[PDB]
Ligand binder design. Structure first.
Ligand SMILES: OC[C@H]1O[C@@H](S[C@H]2[C@H](O)[C@@H](O)[C@H](O[C@H]3[C@H](O)[C@@H](O)[C@H](S[C@H]4[C@H](O)[C@@H](O)[C@H](O[C@H]5[C@H](O)[C@@H](O)[C@H](S[C@H]6[C@H](O)[C@@H](O)[C@H](O[C@H]7[C@H](O)[C@@H](O)[C@H](S[C@H]8[C@H](O)[C@@H](O)[C@H](O)O[C@@H]8CO)O[C@@H]7CO)O[C@@H]6CO)O[C@@H]5CO)O[C@@H]4CO)O[C@@H]3CO)O[C@@H]2CO)[C@H](O)[C@@H](O)[C@@H]1O
Ligand SMILES: [Ca+2]
Ligand SMILES: [Ca+2]
Ligand SMILES: [Cl-]
Length: 629
């Protein structure tokens, strides 16, 4: 039987769970897939409220796992995995073996440069630039008997709002789509949504392919998917807890553990440089593992021909601390129940755990917050690293890895999402490296939490950075990085971040015994429950300062390129964000949003983000278990 839990916080979790699963609240589609948010007019990472992401699916797993802990019923957890495998992990029909089996581990893909402005795309493929060797593909095909990859594609058009349908039929749902393709300056507002399965049926003469890639020949019909490593790692994290809590009650989630383990085996593709170039010596093609940084990079992607047989796979050269997950690495490298079937699966994850913890430490600022990350490909073209730039195993430090509109590390959220995982590791193992990191980080954040007399509160929202960490010397260790400073630009009341923060402080307090962290975690949970609860969970009114981009953001389209979206919207030079998403004008909130912009005001919204609601629910559960009295 499981240990007794705090009755008050357990009830709060159950209440949230009921609101989230309540059919009348609309968090899920008819097919059982959770939406990014109840509200449809939503632009953040995705550009429509009813698309879904792998991040959401992993939070759904975490939620159901906790429900199993308190109810003894894990059928919901197994169902979250069933929905994931059926709809977010490309099936045999979505990534045909005929093409995947033609993959050449000695020539994974063809080099394509990255540019700092979307106007430079399409990017020209260059067969003469070196590409390294993929050392794990043989391990995976031998272990699983297939050339298909088992990982979640990151974004899904749940109700086929864009109209691409499934495998170009234009009518089926859900629909595999993608957005980002053109460099660090292409924000959510500057993309051209495209189908993952491109048969040239929609868009331009050759679909949407020649908007991004340029080659000598004619663009072939092809499919392509992109993984979000932090999402897949969270799936492993959540499944571990589901397994632990299931066994404490004589229950089993064996089938799900097997899927989580397989996913973690394939997740190793994120450990490699985009084009398998040697880490620290980007101009040279890798010979195998010398191209592995062992960190959870921003993505790994793969694709292949539809009407011709060929395939490719790429890792990623850019690393952000926010995507790391030391807990998942500990699970996959030490727990016998989660040991990957591949020959080197567990050992690679063992190396990743150590490398990840060094990464966090190297990036810890003088104050305690964690800095951006590093890259093995300067400017995304393997250019020379500017002299005087600090390095980590040969990779140059970057303040805002991967994207700059806005800066990828200017949002407080990355701090809690990532440190929450370090707190789980510290709690389970008491690891000294995790302790050192948390003691200083927790001291920093506890001094940045502000509680008001009316029961409301504020935490860091937008942050900025100055300087850089000292070059990492494995034998020297943490120098203290006296020249690396974080700056809190402004505060806010982001309920999702606050929930993640409470979670982090709870695990840390439980292990360290730090009372300051424990009471702050409880005050956050109480404040949110007592002051921000509504019939659908929790929420607050927030300003949407970037919404002016709905109408004033021009979308770049190559000269002479013309095409049409499924609903007829014309794609040509000069269009704005709204011009290629005209269906948005039918949204219930549209007139309200436009009215505000016309009056020169900042639009405001009351949003119910699925991950935020789940975060809050899980945080209540965690407190209930670690502090029963
Ligand atoms: O036919 C002739 C011949 O053929 C051959 S076979 C041959 C084929 O023909 C050929 O087509 C094929 O070509 C291959 C090629 O080989 C491969 O090398 C390439 S690889 C390619 C890959 O496919 C593609 O997917 C990849 O895309 C990358 C981009 O490069 C990269 O730039 C971006 S970065 C992006 C991030 O990913 C996003 O997450 C991020 O999003 C941000 C957003 O920017 C930001 O605004 C918001 S801010 C937001 C916060 O999120 C929120 O929390 C807070 O609360 O609020 C704030 C404020 O709102 O955050 C978002 C994140 O959350 O944005 C950045 C920037 O865009 O990443 C994508 C990943 O997808 O690029 C790769 C290349 O660079 O693929 C080709 C396929 O076409 O090659 C074949 C051979 O190899 C045959 O053999 C012959 O016979 C035949 O004759
Ligand atoms: Ca931009
Ligand atoms: Ca700076
Ligand atoms: Cl969001």
């Amino acid at each position: 039987a499981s240990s007794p839990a705090n009755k008050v916080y357990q009830d709060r979790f159950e209440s949230m769970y009921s609101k989230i699963k309540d059919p009348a609240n609309g968090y899920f589609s008819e097919q059982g897939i959770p939406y990014h948010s109840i509200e449809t007019l939503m632009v953040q990472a995705p550009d429509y409220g009813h698309v879904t992401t792998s991040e959401a699916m992993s939070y759904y797993m975490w939620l159901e796992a906790m429900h199993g802990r308190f109810s003894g019923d894990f059928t919901g957890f197994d169902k979250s995995w069933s929905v994931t495998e059926q709809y977010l992990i490309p099936t045999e029909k979505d990534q045909p073996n005929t093409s995947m089996s033609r993959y050449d581990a000695n020539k994974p893909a063809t080099y394509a440069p990255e540019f700092q402005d979307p106007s430079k795309y399409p990017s020209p493929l260059d067969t003469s630039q070196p590409v390294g060797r993929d050392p794990i593909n043989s391990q995976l095909t031998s272990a699983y008997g297939t050339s298909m990859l088992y990982g979640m594609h990151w974004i899904l058009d749940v109700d086929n709002w864009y109209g691409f349908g499934a495998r170009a039929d234009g009518t089926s749902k859900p629909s595999y789509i993608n957005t980002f393709q053109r460099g660090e300056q292409e924000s959510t507002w500057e993309t051209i949504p495209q189908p993952c399965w491109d048969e040239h049926k929609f868009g331009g003469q050759y679909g949407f392919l020649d908007l991004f890639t340029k080659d000598t020949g004619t663009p072939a019909k092809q499919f392509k998917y992109t993984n979000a490593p932090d999402a897949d790692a969270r799936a492993v994290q959540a499944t571990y807890w589901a397994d632990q809590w299931a066994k404490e009650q004589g229950k089993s989630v064996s089938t799900s553990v097997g899927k989580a383990t397989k996913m973690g085996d394939y997740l190793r593709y994120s450990f490699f440089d985009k084009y398998f170039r040697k880490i620290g010596q980007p101009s040279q093609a890798g010979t195998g593992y010398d191209a592995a940084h062992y960190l959870l990079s921003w993505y790994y992607a793969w694709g292949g021909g539809i009407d011709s047989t060929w395939s490719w796979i790429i890792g990623s050269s850019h690393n952000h601390f926010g995507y790391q997950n030391p807990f998942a690495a500990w699970v996959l490298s030490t727990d016998a129940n989660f040991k990957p079937k591949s020959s080197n699966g567990a050992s690679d994850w063992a190396k990743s755990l150590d490398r990840q913890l060094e990464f966090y430490q190297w990036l810890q600022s003088a104050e305690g917050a964690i800095a951006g990350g590093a890259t093995n490909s300067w400017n995304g073209r393997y250019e020379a690293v500017p002299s005087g730039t600090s390095t980590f195993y040969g990779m140059g430090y970057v303040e805002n890895p991967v994207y700059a509109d806005p800066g990828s590390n200017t949002w407080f959220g990355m701090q809690v999402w990532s440190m929450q995982r370090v707190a789980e590791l510290y709690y389970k193992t008491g690891d000294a490296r995790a302790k050192k990191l948390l003691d200083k980080w927790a001291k920093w954040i506890n001094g940045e939490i502000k509680f008001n007399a009316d029961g409301t509160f504020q935490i860091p929202s937008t942050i900025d950075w100055e300087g850089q960490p000292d070059t990492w010397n494995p034998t020297q260790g943490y120098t203290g990085n006296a020249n690396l400073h974080v700056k809190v630009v402004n505060y806010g009341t982001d309920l999702g971040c606050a929930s993640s923060l409470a979670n982090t402080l709870t695990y840390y307090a439980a292990k360290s015994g730090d009372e300051t962290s424990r009471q702050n975690a409880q005050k956050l949970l109480d404040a949110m429950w007592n002051n921000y609860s509504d019939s659908k969970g929790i929420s607050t009114v927030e300003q949407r300062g970037d919404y002016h981009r709905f109408l004033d953001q021009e979308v770049f389209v190559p000269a002479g390129w013309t095409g049409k979206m499924p609903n007829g919207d014309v794609i040509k030079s000069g269009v704005k964000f709204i011009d290629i998403r005209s269906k948005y004008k039918q949204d219930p909130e549209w007139q309200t949003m436009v009215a505000a912009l016309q009056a020169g005001q900042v639009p405001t919204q009351r949003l119910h983000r699925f991950w935020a609601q789940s975060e809050f629910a899980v945080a209540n559960g965690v407190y209930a278990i670690l502090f029963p009295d």
